[PDB]
Design a protein around this nucleic acid. Sequence first.
RNA 1: CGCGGGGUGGAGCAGCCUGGUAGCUCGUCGGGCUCAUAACCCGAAGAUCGUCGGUUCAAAUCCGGCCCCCGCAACCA
RNA 2: CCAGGGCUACACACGUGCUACAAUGGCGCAUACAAAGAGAAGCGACCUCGCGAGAGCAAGCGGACCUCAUAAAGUGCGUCGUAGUCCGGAUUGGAGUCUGCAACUCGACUCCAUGAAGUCGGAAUCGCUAGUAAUCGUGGAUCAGAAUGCCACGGUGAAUAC
RNA 3: UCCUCCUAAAGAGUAACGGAGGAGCACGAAGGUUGGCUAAUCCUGGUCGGACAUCAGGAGGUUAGUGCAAUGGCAUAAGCC
Lengths: 177, 79, 66, 115
Amino acid sequence: AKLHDYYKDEVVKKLMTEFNYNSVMQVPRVEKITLNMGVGEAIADKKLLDNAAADLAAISGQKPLITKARKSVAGFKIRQGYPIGCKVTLRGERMWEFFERLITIAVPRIRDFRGLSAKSFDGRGNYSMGVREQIIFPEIDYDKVDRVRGLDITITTTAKSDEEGRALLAAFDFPFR
Amino acid sequence: RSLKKGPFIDLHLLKKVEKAVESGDKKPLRTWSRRSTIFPNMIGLTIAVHNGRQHVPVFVTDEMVGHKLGEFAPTRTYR
Amino acid sequence: MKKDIHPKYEEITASCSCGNVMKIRSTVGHDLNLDVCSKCHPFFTGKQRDVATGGRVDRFNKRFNI
Amino acid sequence: ARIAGINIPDHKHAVIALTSIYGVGKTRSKAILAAAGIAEDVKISELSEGQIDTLRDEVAKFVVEGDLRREISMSIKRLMDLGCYRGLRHRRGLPVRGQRTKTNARTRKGPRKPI
RNA sequence: CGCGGGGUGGAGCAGCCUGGUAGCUCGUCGGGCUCAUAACCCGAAGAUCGUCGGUUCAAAUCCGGCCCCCGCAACCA
RNA sequence: CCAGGGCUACACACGUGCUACAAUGGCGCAUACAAAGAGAAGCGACCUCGCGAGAGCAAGCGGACCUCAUAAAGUGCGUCGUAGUCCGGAUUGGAGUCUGCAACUCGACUCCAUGAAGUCGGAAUCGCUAGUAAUCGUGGAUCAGAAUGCCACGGUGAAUAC
RNA sequence: UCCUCCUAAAGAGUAACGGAGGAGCACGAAGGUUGGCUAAUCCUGGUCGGACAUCAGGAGGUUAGUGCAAUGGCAUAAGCC
Ligand SMILES: [Mg+2]
Ligand SMILES: [Mg+2]
Ligand SMILES: [Mg+2]
Ligand SMILES: [Mg+2]
Ligand SMILES: [Mg+2]
Ligand SMILES: [Mg+2]
Ligand SMILES: [Mg+2]
Ligand SMILES: [Mg+2]
Ligand SMILES: [Mg+2]
Ligand SMILES: [Mg+2]
Ligand SMILES: [Mg+2]
Ligand SMILES: [Mg+2]
Ligand SMILES: [Mg+2]
Ligand SMILES: [Mg+2]
Ligand SMILES: [Mg+2]
Ligand SMILES: [Mg+2]
Ligand SMILES: [Mg+2]
Ligand SMILES: [Mg+2]
Ligand SMILES: [Mg+2]
Ligand SMILES: [Mg+2]
Ligand SMILES: [Mg+2]
Ligand SMILES: [Mg+2]
Ligand SMILES: [Mg+2]
Ligand SMILES: [Mg+2]
Ligand SMILES: [Mg+2]
Ligand SMILES: [Mg+2]
Ligand SMILES: [Mg+2]
Ligand SMILES: [Mg+2]
Ligand SMILES: [Mg+2]
Ligand SMILES: [Mg+2]
Ligand SMILES: [Mg+2]
Ligand SMILES: [Mg+2]
Ligand SMILES: [Mg+2]
Ligand SMILES: [Mg+2]
Ligand SMILES: [Mg+2]
Ligand SMILES: [Mg+2]
Ligand SMILES: [Mg+2]
Ligand SMILES: [Mg+2]
Ligand SMILES: [Mg+2]
Ligand SMILES: [Mg+2]
Ligand SMILES: [Mg+2]
Ligand SMILES: [Mg+2]
Ligand SMILES: [Mg+2]
Ligand SMILES: [Mg+2]
Ligand SMILES: [Mg+2]
Ligand SMILES: [Mg+2]
Ligand SMILES: [Mg+2]
Ligand SMILES: [Mg+2]
Ligand SMILES: [Mg+2]
Ligand SMILES: [Mg+2]
Ligand SMILES: [Mg+2]
Ligand SMILES: [Mg+2]
Ligand SMILES: [Mg+2]
Ligand SMILES: [Mg+2]
Ligand SMILES: [Mg+2]
Ligand SMILES: [Mg+2]
Ligand SMILES: [Mg+2]
Ligand SMILES: [Mg+2]
Ligand SMILES: [Mg+2]
Ligand SMILES: [Mg+2]
Ligand SMILES: [Mg+2]
Ligand SMILES: [Mg+2]
Ligand SMILES: [Mg+2]
Ligand SMILES: [Mg+2]
Ligand SMILES: [Mg+2]
Ligand SMILES: [Mg+2]
């Protein structure tokens, strides 16, 4: 909630001076955050997926989608329409609420932390993070989980060059290398 | 590791290095003293340490200081 | 959002040992306790202390001193 | 029960609780609790939050976890770049402190292989 | 040339005509026993399945060519 | 005759040890009981500096006197409660210490962090008939330094031999 | 015996012990209808995660898919929901 109001007032005005944008709509804005969790090991144990879904449902506010396998492949032994991973495509109000909770408290709790990757952009301003542990978020109880599983965060923007998209995230006091 | 009473180098290698450094860079010094440590003034010199049957050239760098000369000259060859 | 299917997304107060009180909204419960935050984490000093570790020649001079 | 990088033990004495921290052992942990002013006989369940915050600043003095792991990784990686006897020892996967390598050395060399 | 059937650790055989993780008996290798060798006891490694290809999500196993091997036919005047 | 290097190499295989895998055990504090040695470029008190190896000053003794020298098992309280554990204590990194012209190949020990295999061992198989096996110290010889070996010493102290 | 393509000479038909492939079913949802949707394969970034599982954006645009051969056909989608 607060970071959306902070963005509207403080950030835009900061980004306007950098690349002399002619309009207020030209500023890159954060469209959605897509938390992804390709559990994978659900081939052997079916419940292990439902364990991951609950953990995503705890980490994010909303419940996750169980994503089916797109095609069948022999490398991992999977078939058409088999539940291989879980996802959440949270956006709007709860997104800014999660985005604060990520950068402000969770990201600091990463083990062996130093500085997050500056190179990590798609060439279109869309950032992604890869968290190793679920324990970094304070929602998960310590004596509940029993697997070294994690997710990946995926910040989608309305930018056009990673050069342009870096400043947006940098304006939120985001830790880069 | 041993020796707190001054890091040890052989008289001959000390005088050979001091004579080499003041004049300028030239060629690999034929030295058999592996036991001797490496001073800061030895940086730049490509001194040739005796592995046992021949002399192995060693370009002394910023890191090669506290270590001894025999560490950069493998004696027993394998495979 | 679809009501009933989601878990309870309630407001809670984060309060680290440093002193930074901070209200947020998440699926935890009653209260929170934290170690570090965006403020108080050693990354601004961390990179200063981590990079300036090396130095072999002065270490030799500290032993001999002559 | 959340100091330094990890430290989350329970039903364990305060001295033995901090052994689980990487970069803190037996005698170091006694120096932490001596400086903190906490008894060694108590456990983390028995302790309050007011006392745990003093342990956080005390372990911050010593190099621990990711700070220490990189300091060790730097020192091993340094030796290998020099091309010294120890560097050749490290990368070849053989014992370093002038040990017997003929019969034993199974810790460093790993388990048995065919001929 | 025609129609059956084959080609799988070093050897001989299963698993092959119903595509999903290759056994058996020997030999080789390591250790035992013995004065020593054999026998015997105890572990272990060793085959991408003739090859070039197609079908498939995936081929030792399905389908086609080529390369060998083995049987039966190759007749009436 | 000399400078280094090597005898300490390392896909592997065995011999002989030692330390384990714990709760009859592990780590802390209160403190009781040996023998046999050994010492003059020797053994080196007590003091003081050391977190400790050790560093100074230096007392005494060619010794039933002086010194290395508090034996440890063992009690007595505490605490961990069956965990790869407060078991094991390997391995690595760093910081050192004495000796010694010199410690990297290639020493010993100390501190700190590190915390591997291992949960009693396949076919087999070894020693042992009482202060013996078993277990805990301790010394000496060679030796500047370098034992888990060797040679001695004494603690608690079994089972079984129809 | 039945289906598809060529042979078959721009309607249909058209032989040979001519040239290549399939069928002897499947499905109470794989039918009906209403309301939606858009693919392959790459590029770059991202925990374990690697060429490839799941995510994000960008590229291409029907190379896709069509319960099974081959043919003709389908974005109004006959495609997938
Ligand atoms: Mg060679
Ligand atoms: Mg220790
Ligand atoms: Mg200690
Ligand atoms: Mg050792
Ligand atoms: Mg050696
Ligand atoms: Mg054969
Ligand atoms: Mg099989
Ligand atoms: Mg056999
Ligand atoms: Mg086998
Ligand atoms: Mg092979
Ligand atoms: Mg199929
Ligand atoms: Mg099929
Ligand atoms: Mg197969
Ligand atoms: Mg089968
Ligand atoms: Mg020898
Ligand atoms: Mg040795
Ligand atoms: Mg070889
Ligand atoms: Mg063996
Ligand atoms: Mg212990
Ligand atoms: Mg013990
Ligand atoms: Mg005497
Ligand atoms: Mg005395
Ligand atoms: Mg005293
Ligand atoms: Mg100490
Ligand atoms: Mg001294
Ligand atoms: Mg003295
Ligand atoms: Mg007298
Ligand atoms: Mg007297
Ligand atoms: Mg003594
Ligand atoms: Mg006394
Ligand atoms: Mg004493
Ligand atoms: Mg006394
Ligand atoms: Mg005791
Ligand atoms: Mg462990
Ligand atoms: Mg184990
Ligand atoms: Mg140790
Ligand atoms: Mg441990
Ligand atoms: Mg156990
Ligand atoms: Mg036994
Ligand atoms: Mg036993
Ligand atoms: Mg026997
Ligand atoms: Mg016997
Ligand atoms: Mg007898
Ligand atoms: Mg013992
Ligand atoms: Mg002892
Ligand atoms: Mg002894
Ligand atoms: Mg003696
Ligand atoms: Mg001994
Ligand atoms: Mg002994
Ligand atoms: Mg007909
Ligand atoms: Mg035509
Ligand atoms: Mg026609
Ligand atoms: Mg026609
Ligand atoms: Mg016509
Ligand atoms: Mg007609
Ligand atoms: Mg006709
Ligand atoms: Mg015809
Ligand atoms: Mg047919
Ligand atoms: Mg129905
Ligand atoms: Mg339907
Ligand atoms: Mg329908
Ligand atoms: Mg309706
Ligand atoms: Mg429709
Ligand atoms: Mg198509
Ligand atoms: Mg078609
Ligand atoms: Mg459908």
